[PDB]
Amino acid sequence: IVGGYTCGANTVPYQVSLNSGYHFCGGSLINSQWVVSAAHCYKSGIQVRLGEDNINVVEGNEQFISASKSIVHPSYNSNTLNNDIMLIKLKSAASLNSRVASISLPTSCASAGTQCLISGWGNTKSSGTSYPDVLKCLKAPILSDSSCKSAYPGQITSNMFCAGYLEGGKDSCQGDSGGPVVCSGKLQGIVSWGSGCAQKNKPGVYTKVCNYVSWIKQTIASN
Ligand SMILES: Nc1nc2ccccc2[nH]1
Ligand SMILES: [Ca+2]
Fold this sequence. Notes:
Radius of gyration: 16 Å
Helix content: under 10%
Number of domains: 2
PDB class: hydrolase
Assembly: monomeric
Number of strands: 13
CATH class of the largest domain: Mainly Beta
Bound molecules: 1H-benzimidazol-2-amine, calcium ion
Name: trypsin
Keywords: serine protease, hydrolase
Distance between the termini: 33 Å
CATH architecture of the largest domain: Beta Barrel
Shape: globular
Strand order of the largest sheet: 1-9-8-11-12-13-10
Entry title: bovine trypsin 2-aminobenzimidazole complex
Order of helices and strands: EEEEEEEEEHEEEEH
């Protein structure tokens, strides 16, 4: 997260860190047994870390749970990043409490101008490398379709939205992939891709979660 602020311990109780000997991607808890993340975050042998603040210190509220099953969306295209969403089932149910909580799925799509909260443990430098140990937060608006497609000609599908600032300086970045974009208490997006981080006229690109609710609900119910 570039140009954001320190969230504060367990303020984003739905935020998950995916670990495979180290933190590699963010995720969102949608229920006591399931996590939503980005398909580009797929890896074998994932450990789901809940209730985390500092990813390098055991602070007392963490739940470490192995993944039992991983499901990448059937139409995921690694080349275009179209349909960048995957579902992760936990070996055992997480205990929901004040610090570990689930985020609900949208009943409808958010419109441009809606303010959202983007969170993660990714790079904090525009051009440099500095990884935080604590969860970073960023309030950002959904941008208009037209300004998104203007920034990335022929790359934006109906399954993606842009969020951030065209002036640059504040965006998501490497390490935040698969992380949540929450607008008016519902998971509206997943950190997917972009061109560099916080560059002018190059905002973040997010998977448009409202397009996958049916797929998510049906998949979870049958697994
Ligand atoms: N804005 C932005 N967000 C990103 C997330 C992962 C990789 C590159 C990125 N650029
Ligand atoms: Ca910790």
